[PDB]
RNA sequence: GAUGGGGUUAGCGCAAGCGAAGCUCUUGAUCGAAGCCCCGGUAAACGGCGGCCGUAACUAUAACGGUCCUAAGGUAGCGA
Protein backbone atom coordinates (compact mmCIF):
# COMPACT_ATOMS: atom_id res chain seq x y z
CA UNK A 1 0.00 0.00 0.00
CA UNK A 2 1.75 3.03 -1.22
CA UNK A 3 0.29 6.84 -0.84
CA UNK A 4 -1.51 8.43 -3.83
CA UNK A 5 0.58 11.98 -4.27
CA UNK A 6 -2.09 14.07 -5.11
CA UNK A 7 -1.57 17.78 -6.96
CA UNK A 8 -3.43 19.40 -4.47
CA UNK A 9 -0.62 20.56 -2.07
CA UNK A 10 -1.70 21.19 1.25
CA UNK A 11 -5.20 20.40 1.54
CA UNK A 12 -7.00 22.28 4.37
CA UNK A 13 -10.99 22.20 4.64
CA UNK A 14 -11.60 18.95 2.92
CA UNK A 15 -9.76 16.07 1.63
CA UNK A 16 -12.05 13.69 -0.23
CA UNK A 17 -13.98 17.16 -2.06
CA UNK A 18 -9.85 18.00 -3.19
CA UNK A 19 -9.28 14.47 -4.23
CA UNK A 20 -12.46 14.78 -6.26
CA UNK A 21 -11.40 17.50 -7.65
CA UNK A 22 -7.90 15.95 -9.07
CA UNK A 23 -6.65 13.66 -11.35
CA UNK A 24 -7.10 10.31 -9.74
CA UNK A 25 -11.14 11.07 -10.04
CA UNK A 26 -10.72 12.64 -13.51
CA UNK A 27 -13.38 11.63 -15.75
CA UNK A 28 -12.80 8.53 -17.69
CA UNK A 29 -14.69 8.71 -21.20
CA UNK A 30 -14.56 4.98 -23.45
CA UNK A 31 -13.39 5.15 -27.32
CA UNK A 32 -16.43 4.35 -29.17
CA UNK A 33 -16.07 0.83 -31.14
CA UNK A 34 -18.82 2.43 -33.55
CA UNK A 35 -20.22 5.54 -33.79
CA UNK A 36 -18.18 8.97 -33.61
CA UNK A 37 -14.70 8.46 -31.84
CA UNK A 38 -14.55 5.16 -33.52
CA UNK A 39 -12.75 4.67 -36.34
CA UNK A 40 -9.86 3.15 -36.34
CA UNK A 41 -6.46 3.94 -38.60
CA UNK A 42 -5.40 0.08 -37.62
CA UNK A 43 -6.92 -3.05 -35.80
CA UNK A 44 -5.55 -4.10 -32.59
CA UNK A 45 -3.95 -7.00 -34.85
CA UNK A 46 -3.41 -4.84 -37.72
C1' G B 1 -39.07 113.14 -16.29
C1' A B 2 -44.15 110.49 -19.02
C1' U B 3 -48.44 109.90 -15.98
C1' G B 4 -50.74 110.18 -11.33
C1' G B 5 -51.31 112.20 -6.37
C1' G B 6 -50.90 116.37 -3.06
C1' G B 7 -49.76 122.17 -1.19
C1' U B 8 -50.74 127.17 -2.21
C1' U B 9 -54.85 130.53 -4.63
C1' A B 10 -57.13 134.44 -8.96
C1' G B 11 -62.06 133.25 -9.30
C1' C B 12 -67.15 130.88 -8.24
C1' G B 13 -71.22 129.18 -4.98
C1' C B 14 -76.54 132.55 0.23
C1' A B 15 -72.51 126.94 1.61
C1' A B 16 -70.00 122.36 2.75
C1' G B 17 -66.80 122.87 -1.05
C1' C B 18 -64.75 123.29 -6.07
C1' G B 19 -60.74 125.59 -8.10
C1' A B 20 -57.70 128.61 -13.82
C1' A B 21 -52.59 130.03 -14.49
C1' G B 22 -48.16 129.92 -12.17
C1' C B 23 -44.73 128.32 -8.51
C1' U B 24 -44.01 124.09 -5.65
C1' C B 25 -43.64 118.77 -2.71
C1' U B 26 -44.02 113.97 -4.29
C1' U B 27 -44.65 109.59 -7.60
C1' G B 28 -41.16 107.61 -11.51
C1' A B 29 -43.59 105.60 -17.77
C1' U B 30 -39.65 105.79 -21.32
C1' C B 31 -34.21 105.92 -22.44
C1' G B 32 -29.87 103.71 -20.73
C1' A B 33 -23.47 100.52 -20.70
C1' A B 34 -20.39 97.25 -18.45
C1' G B 35 -21.31 93.68 -14.81
C1' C B 36 -24.31 89.39 -12.95
C1' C B 37 -27.52 85.43 -14.53
C1' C B 38 -26.89 83.02 -19.23
C1' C B 39 -24.06 79.94 -23.74
C1' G B 40 -19.29 77.96 -24.80
C1' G B 41 -13.75 77.03 -24.10
C1' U B 42 -9.50 76.47 -20.63
C1' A B 43 -6.02 71.87 -15.71
C1' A B 44 2.63 72.69 -17.05
C1' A B 45 -5.04 77.69 -14.38
C1' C B 46 -6.67 77.04 -8.54
C1' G B 47 -8.00 72.31 -7.96
C1' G B 48 -10.32 66.98 -8.10
C1' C B 49 -9.19 61.85 -9.53
C1' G B 50 -15.61 56.58 -5.49
C1' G B 51 -18.66 52.94 -2.69
C1' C B 52 -21.36 48.32 -1.25
C1' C B 53 -22.41 42.88 -2.61
C1' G B 54 -21.34 38.42 -5.13
C1' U B 55 -18.19 35.09 -8.19
C1' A B 56 -12.95 29.88 -10.22
C1' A B 57 -10.54 22.44 -10.25
C1' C B 58 -10.77 21.53 -1.12
C1' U B 59 -8.87 26.29 0.81
C1' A B 60 -7.88 31.36 -0.26
C1' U B 61 -8.13 34.98 -3.63
C1' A B 62 -11.00 37.00 -7.44
C1' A B 63 -9.23 38.13 -13.89
C1' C B 64 -15.44 38.22 -14.11
C1' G B 65 -20.41 40.14 -12.84
C1' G B 66 -24.41 43.04 -10.08
C1' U B 67 -25.88 47.70 -8.14
C1' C B 68 -25.57 52.88 -6.37
C1' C B 69 -23.01 57.35 -7.10
C1' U B 70 -19.69 61.05 -9.63
C1' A B 71 -17.28 66.53 -13.20
C1' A B 72 -14.13 62.35 -13.38
C1' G B 73 -13.31 58.05 -10.38
C1' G B 74 -5.62 57.61 -9.44
C1' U B 75 -2.95 55.73 -15.55
C1' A B 76 2.62 54.92 -15.83
C1' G B 77 5.78 54.55 -12.16
C1' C B 78 6.77 54.09 -7.14
C1' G B 79 5.17 52.18 -2.33
C1' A B 80 5.56 50.64 6.00
MG1 LIG C 1 -25.66 94.56 -20.88
MG1 LIG D 1 -8.83 70.04 -21.80
MG1 LIG E 1 -0.55 50.72 -10.73
MG1 LIG F 1 9.82 47.73 9.72
Given at each position: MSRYQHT???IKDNAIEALLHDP???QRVEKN???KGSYMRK????
Open positions: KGQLFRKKGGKHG
